[PDB]
Amino acid sequence: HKVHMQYDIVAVTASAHDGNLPENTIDGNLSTRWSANGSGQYITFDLGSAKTVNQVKAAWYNGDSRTSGFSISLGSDPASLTEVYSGTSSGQTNALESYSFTATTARYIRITGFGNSSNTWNSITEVAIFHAGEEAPGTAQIPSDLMSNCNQWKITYPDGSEDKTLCGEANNEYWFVNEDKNAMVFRAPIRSNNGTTPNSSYVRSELRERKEDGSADIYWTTTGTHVVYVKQAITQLPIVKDHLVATQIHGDKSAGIDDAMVMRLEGNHLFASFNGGKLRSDLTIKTNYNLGTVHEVIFEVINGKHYLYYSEDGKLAEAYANGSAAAYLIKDGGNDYVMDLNYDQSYFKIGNYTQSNSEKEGSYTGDPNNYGEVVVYDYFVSHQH
Ligand SMILES: [Ca+2]
Ligand SMILES: [K+]
């Protein structure tokens, strides 16, 4: 189900009534009604303040035996109202009918009545006011706009190519700005023979940490304080092997470290994985992760101690900045930290590493919806010693 928010109607007035009061339209009762005789008469609903509205619902007196003509108008003052919908009721139901229009800011909503099939009465039994289907929109045009330092990363695409100079790059099919112009999207489709990427290799659209001037790949150590914060949603998984890696700390394979600490989603299972189980056992974050749920995550390394913070409440960045973030730690038994280990040659990765390919998807390879996807609203990293 798409999400549909319902605004409370705090008051209602009208140009006219015959003793069937305007309040009768919001009492949840099908046997009470508003009535006013004459084309042009209207009822006006008040939401208390201005809200984004894109749907009005009405149920009509004799809604299943006659049709009613009307128009809807919206705005912040009752003399500043602009028309957004006009038409006729269906004549086939006594329940709510949905009338939807361009989302518009309004405090007041007015239905104007033009009589009905039989006579000039306007009569309404129920009315509701809605936004039908959540981060504030932005002004991003290209993915580099969402990066605070566009020099500090390089991207690796699913076609096997790389870009070390992301400042100014255009939106592409693997890395682009979402609709609301507030996030970057890392899309990793599953296809056979995609550029130089082997069919048996897994598929990434993801950032690798660089020096802040972009001169080269950066390597750091577990000594000192090192942080990655990401606000993101995992929005899609492949069809057969619905497995995907988002945020990561990486060291050398040669040292038995490799992908030391990563966030992984398998189905609804969201967990942290430590060199794929070779350092320590997977640690579960959530068993019921729903695709498209915006979360925040921090990996924090302090002289070898690895801490995991997770939140779906929107407040993790604010809390970490205010110093009150302990509430969001993912604890492991009776330890505040999920792992203690020292290594060097370490760097961060952010984005989408989809753990599937053409061999695992087989016949569903090339399918339109056979891709992994990660939407990143915000992120930062810090280093200290
Ligand atoms: Ca009623
Ligand atoms: K470039």
Author numbering: -5 to -1, 188 to 315, 322 to 573
Give me lines lifted from the publication on this model.
In order to understand the relationship between these CBMs and the catalytic domain, we have characterized AlyQ’s activity and substrate binding, as well as solved the structure of a truncated version containing the CBM32 and catalytic domains. However, only AlyQBC successfully formed crystals, diffracting up to 2.2 Å in space group P41212 with one molecule in the asymmetric unit. In accordance to size-exclusion chromatography results, analysis with Pisa26 showed that all crystal contacts were not significant — AlyQBC exists as a monomer while domains B and C do not interact with one another. Residues E316–N321 in the region linking the two domains were disordered. A Ca2+ ion is found coordinated by the side chains of the strictly conserved D209 and T214, and the main chains of N206, N211, T214 and T307. W124 of YeCBM32, which when substituted with Ala resulted in only very weak affinity for the ligand polygalaturonic acid, is conserved in domain B as W303, and the region around this Trp, which is highly variable and involved in binding different sugars in CBM32 members, is also highly similar between AlyQ and YeCBM32. Moreover, an acetic acid molecule from the crystallisation buffer is found binding to the nearby R248, which may mimic the carboxyl group of an uronic acid. Subsites +1 to +3 are relatively well conserved between the two, and the three key residues for catalysis — Q436 neutralizing the substrate’s carboxyl group, H438 as a general base and Y541 as a general acid — were superposed well with A1-II’s Q189, H191 and Y284 to interact with the ligand, indicating AlyQ also employs a similar mechanism for alginate cleavage. A shift in AlyQ’s loop L1, however, is observed, which may represent the open conformation. Notably, if the GGMG ligand were to bind to AlyQ as it did to A1-II′, it would have crashed with AlyQ’s D446 and D447 at subsites +1 and −1 — D447 would especially repel the carboxyl group at subsite −1.
Alginate is degraded by alginate lyases via a β-elimination mechanism to yield 4,5-unsaturated sugar at the non-reducing end. Persicobacter sp. CCB-QB2, an agarolytic bacterium isolated from seaweed (genus Ulva) in a coastal area of Malaysia9, was found to encode a PL7 alginate lyase, AlyQ, in its genome. Like many multidomain alginate lyases, AlyQ contains two additional carbohydrate-binding modules (CBMs) at its N terminus. AlyQ’s first domain moderately resembles family 16 CBM (CBM16), while the second domain belongs to family 32 CBM (CBM32).
